[PDB]
């Protein structure tokens, strides 16, 4: 879910901006 | 931006320079 | 006064491992 | 709600449990 | 109150010129 | 103004330097 | 003989500690 | 008064609470 998107593969500052309240 | 696999502790420290005064949470489960 | 901006990192540092499978829930406002 | 005590004071691997996810 | 503004961040004369009578 | 992150005798005393003979209230409470 | 201006910057010491968390009131007028 | 006694005379940290916030 949260990690596979950023950890397995790469993740971007915006793709990551959804992981904030 | 810096983009790589992001796992372990190294990531939990990422939302700290990107998330701001708002707040956050952490889910270890992939 | 104490700087949590710095101080917290060590802490926001610690929330991850000690938390494990659960992860944490932070709020940089209170 | 911990960030104001666990800063100038000391809490480790047993007191902070209170605020973890 | 005043702390979030002035101790956590820097406060200028007129920013606290509101804190008095 | 001396622009700084003031706390302790660094703060409230300074008010009486600028806040005048009117008075003041101290809210340590965030 | 009677320097409130000094009494005020010295007392202001004892005002903050005793009432550092409850805070305090002052009116230099008075 | 507050400016009368604590100044020509010293005050004890207990009575100090008489004039607190
Ligand atoms: Cl590694
Ligand atoms: Cl200091
Ligand atoms: Cl530090
Ligand atoms: Cl003096
Ligand atoms: Na590190
Ligand atoms: Na001093
Ligand atoms: Zn590593
Ligand atoms: Zn540090
Ligand atoms: Zn100091
Ligand atoms: Zn003095």
Descriptive overview:
The complex is a heterooctamer, with four copies of chain A (21 residues) and four copies of chain B (30 residues). With 21 residues, chain A is an all-alpha fold. Chain A has one helix and no strands. Chain A has one helix spanning 2-8. Chain A is flat and about 20 Å long. Chain A starts with a helix and ends in a 13-residue tail after the last helix. Chain B has 30 residues and is an alpha+beta fold. Chain B is flat. Chains in contact: A-B, B-C, C-D, C-F, E-F, F-G, G-H. The B-C interface holds B 9, 12-13, 16, 19-29 and C 8-9, 12-13, 15-17, 19-29. The complex binds chloride ion (4 copies), sodium ion (2 copies) and zinc ion (4 copies). One chloride ion (CL) binds next to helix 1 of chain G.
- Coarse shape of chain A: flat
Bound ligands, named by name, code or SMILES: chloride ion, sodium ion, zinc ion
Our measurement of the CA-to-CA distance between the termini of chain A, rounded to an integer number of angstroms, reads 16 Å
Helix content of chain B: 25-40%
SSE succession of chain B: HHE
Beta-strand content bin of chain A: under 5%
- Quaternary status: heterooctamer
The class by helix and strand makeup of chain B works out as alpha+beta
Report the strand count of chain A.
0
Rg over CA atoms of chain B? 10 Å
Question: Percentage of helical residues of chain A?
Answer: 25-40%
What is the tally of helical segments of chain A? 1
Task: Give the count of structural domains of chain B.
Answer: 1
Q: Helices and strands of chain A, in N-to-C order?
A: H
> What distance separates the N and C termini of chain B?
22 Å
Strands of chain B, total number = 1
Q: What is the largest interface, and how many residues per chain?
A: E-F, 18 and 20 residues
Morphology call of chain B: flat
Helices of chain B, by number, come to: 2
Return the structural class of chain A: mainly alpha
Organism (chains B, C, F, G): Homo sapiens (Human)
Protein name (chains B, C, F, G): Insulin B chain
